[PDB]
Amino acid sequence: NYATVNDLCARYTRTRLDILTRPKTADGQPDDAVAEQALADASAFIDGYLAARFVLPLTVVPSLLKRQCCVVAWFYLNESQPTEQITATYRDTVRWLEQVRDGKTDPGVESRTAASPEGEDLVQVQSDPPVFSRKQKGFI
Amino acid sequence: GRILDISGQPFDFDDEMQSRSDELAMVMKRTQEHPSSGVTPNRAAQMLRDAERGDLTAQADLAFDMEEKDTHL
């Protein structure tokens, strides 16, 4: 997963996270595996939206992707009855992921070293070996 | 023995060839430049001007390449 539960419980108040999680567990006591599973599902969502033009086991993780995983995990964790703002922000992050997949916006870099994640060649052409090109310094 | 040339200057005639004088062994053996590879009119003018000033090497190599390359020529 892109973001750990210790970050989702920091961006979103831990008490509200416990309130959301405690029903979903089998026993009925605050649990941590539910949040990790939701974060894994959100990371899978982002991975699917990024694999279009990136090598998906990201060499360097864009620093905004932690936020983009936390928001989607929060929406996935409020599926029974979400606030209007939660839905609006989830639609905004889906729009951002669609723009990233299309090519309108790059995901960003790692804020530590400003390195952008690599990916496979979106465009690739092959032609026959070049003959009579200007690089052939013979003749002329 | 002091044979005079056409201009009437006496000298001594030697049977040894001038190139085979044991002093011009490293200047009579030159590997050709082939300057006609990627010629630009600026560079052709430069070699022509160098030949005009006196250094005829580049002009001669260029002429040789023109003779062997351009079939109609």
UniProtKB/Swiss-Prot annotation, chain A:
Keywords noted in UniProt: Host cytoplasm, Late protein
Keyword Chaperone: no
Induction: Expressed in the late phase of the viral replicative cycle. Expression of late genes is activated by the viral late transcription activator C.
Disruption phenotype: Accumulation of unattached tails and full heads.
Pfam families found in the cross-reference section: Phage_Mu_Gp36 (PF07030)
Species of the source: Escherichia phage Mu
Chain intervals for the UniProt region annotation (Disordered): 101-140
Gene Ontology cellular component list: host cell cytoplasm
Main location: host cell
Protein known as: Gene product J
Compartments (UniProt record): Host cytoplasm
Swiss-Prot record, chain B:
PTM (free text): Cleavage by the viral I protease yields a C-terminally cleaved portal protein competent for DNA packaging and procpasid maturation.
Subcellular location: Virion; Host cytoplasm
Cysteine disulfide partners in this protein: none
Domain of life of the organism encoding this protein: Viruses
Induction comment: Expressed in the late phase of the viral replicative cycle. Expression of late genes is activated by the viral late transcription activator C.
Subunit structure: Homododecamer. Part of the immature prohead complex. Might interact with viral I protease; this interaction gives rise to an early 25S initiator complex. The scaffolding protein Z and the capsid protein T should then be added to this initiator complex to yield the immature prohead. Host GroEL and GroES are also essential for the correct assembly of viral head and tail.
Role description: Forms the portal vertex of the capsid. This portal plays critical roles in head assembly, genome packaging, neck/tail attachment, and genome ejection. The portal protein multimerizes as a single ring-shaped homododecamer arranged around a central channel. Binds to the terminase subunits to form the packaging machine. Acts as a linker between the capsid and tail. Required for attachment of the neck proteins to the capsid.
Protein's name according to its UniProt entry: Portal protein
Species of provenance: Escherichia phage Mu
